[PDB]
Design an enzyme around this catalytic site. Structure first.
Site, PDB file in Angstrom:
ATOM      1  CG  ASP A 174      43.588  -3.453  -6.141  1.00 36.03           C
ATOM      2  OD1 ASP A 174      44.653  -2.922  -5.701  1.00 36.03           O
ATOM      3  OD2 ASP A 174      42.466  -3.239  -5.591  1.00 36.03           O
ATOM      4  CB  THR A 175      49.611  -5.068  -6.501  1.00 35.94           C
ATOM      5  OG1 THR A 175      49.690  -3.627  -6.403  1.00 35.94           O
ATOM      6  CG2 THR A 175      50.046  -5.487  -7.913  1.00 35.94           C
ATOM      7  N   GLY A 176      46.972  -4.336  -4.464  1.00 34.07           N
ATOM      8  CA  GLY A 176      46.570  -4.059  -3.102  1.00 34.07           C
ATOM      9  C   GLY A 176      45.314  -4.815  -2.665  1.00 34.07           C
TER      10      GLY A 176
END
Length: 99
Positions: free
Chosen positions: A25-27
């Site tokens: 999850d890059t967020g």
């Protein structure tokens, strides 16, 4: 490996001697793993996103293998629908977004 985004980017990790599935999850600033009786002194933390915050236990210097790549860092433990690998560990394994 190259991971496309047609489906949720779920991979196998290893933490605390347990194998689990987790979402890359890059967020996510941090890494959040579902109820896992991890050893160590921890500090309380609240983390947030859509629909608000949950309380978690912050453990530091926890080794986490991601797809064969060894990382070591902070892991937050609390109730989550999905285990989440965040940027704090993705950076340690040389992960990038490309387009």
């Amino acid at each position: 490996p190259q991971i496309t985004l047609w489906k949720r980017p779920l991979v196998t990790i290893r933490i605390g001697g347990q194998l689990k599935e987790a979402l890359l999850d890059t967020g996510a600033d941090d890494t959040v793993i579902e109820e896992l009786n991890l050893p160590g002194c921890w500090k309380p933390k609240l983390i947030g996103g859509i629909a608000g915050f949950i309380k978690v236990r912050q453990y530091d210097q926890i080794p986490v293998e991601i797809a064969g790549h060894k990382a070591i860092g902070t892991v937050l433990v609390g109730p989550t629908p999905v285990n989440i690998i965040g940027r704090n560990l993705l950076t340690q394994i040389g992960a990038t977004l490309n387009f």
